[PDB]
A paper describes a structure:
Another heme b containing protein class with a novel type of nitrite reaction is the nitrophorins (NPs) that originate from the saliva of the blood feeding insect Rhodnius prolixus. At least five isoforms appear concurrently in the insect saliva, termed NP1–4 and NP7.13,14 The biological function of the ferriheme b NPs has been established as an NO transporter. Interestingly, NPs were found to be able to convert nitrite into NO via a ‘nitrite-only’ mechanism with the stoichiometry of the nitrite disproportionation reaction. In summary, the key factors that facilitate the nitrite dismutase reaction of NPs have been established to be the heme ruffling and an extended H-bonding network at the active site which helps to keep the proximal His residue neutral.
Inspired by this result, we measured the EPR spectrum of the nitrite complex with NP4(D30N). It shows that nitrite binds to the heme iron in an N-bound nitro form like in the cases of NP4[NO2–] and NP4(L130R)[NO2–]. The two mutations D30N and L130R, however, dramatically interfere with the distal heme pocket in the sense that the Asp30···water···water···nitrite H-bonding network of the wt protein is disrupted in both cases. In line with this are the slightly larger Fe–Nnitrite bond distances observed in the complexes of NP4(L130R)[NO2–] (2.1 Å) and NP4(D30N)[NO2–] (2.1 Å) compared to that of NP4[NO2–] (2.0 Å) (compare Fig. 3).
Residue numbers in the entry: 1 to 184
The structure:
């Protein structure tokens, strides 16, 4: 289960974050042991469509090849803090698993600037018992974490040395599909 009430960035700029562009996960920290594979890759696009906040997600396991996409409409809890019902889709936006109650994640943007972000997410999926996940994001694939986001990790009282890097995994990203999915 999740245990953290993540605090959103003071002065979070939603229009800049939800601009339709892609964010790559470069480093992550799951608070629950063995909750996720130690080698993994993920990216998301965040944008608006008809005034609705949307995210499209991409997960890729570089070992098993398990690959999936999701689309979510985000509902606002407060500035920088959202609740998202996800539907699993193929890369084209075709629905594979419909939205259902109890299938949702929370999403909190703890820090963001032009090129980087620190987020917290808590995933709820059926009767699975999942824990908190922090992720360092960058606009550039596999970019080393800069001083601003690393300082934000510290300011959140987290130890960046504990984060697991995705940068060394052989991962490819379909950034074009992520951007197109925002409308789906
Ligand atoms: C490298 C970072 C991440 C890792 C290692 C990771 C790991 C995983 C794993 C292992 C699953 C499968 C869970 C299951 O089916 O039992 C999963 C599903 C999921 N994750 Fe992540 N994740 C990451 C980043 C993210 C982010 C940033 C978000 C939200 C912004 C997210 C949202 C979701 C959602 C919505 C599902 C379920 C999708 C579906 O079943 O259709 N993940 N993740
Ligand atoms: O571990 N996916 O939120």
């Amino acid at each position: 289960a999740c245990t953290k009430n993540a605090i959103a960035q003071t002065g979070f700029n939603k229009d800049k974050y939800f601009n339709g562009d892609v964010w790559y996960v470069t480093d992550y920290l799951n608070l629950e042991p063995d909750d996720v594979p130690k080698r993994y890759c993920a990216a998301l696009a965040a944008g608006t469509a008809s005034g609705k906040l949307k995210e499209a997600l991409y997960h890729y396991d570089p070992k098993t090849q398990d690959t999936f996409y999701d689309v979510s409409e985000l509902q606002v809890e407060s500035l920088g803090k959202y609740t998202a019902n996800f539907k699993k889709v193929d890369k084209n936006g075709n629905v594979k698993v419909a939205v259902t109650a109890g299938n949702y994640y929370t999403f909190t943007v703890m820090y963001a600037d032009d090129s980087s972000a620190l987020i917290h997410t808590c995933l709820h999926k059926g009767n699975k018992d999942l824990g908190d996940l922090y992720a360092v994001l960058n606009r550039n694939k596999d970019a080393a974490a800069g001083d601003k986001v690393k300082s934000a990790v510290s300011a959140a009282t987290l130890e960046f040395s504990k984060f697991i890097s995705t940068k060394e995994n052989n991962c490819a990203y379909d950034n074009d599909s992520l951007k197109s999915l925002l409308t789906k």
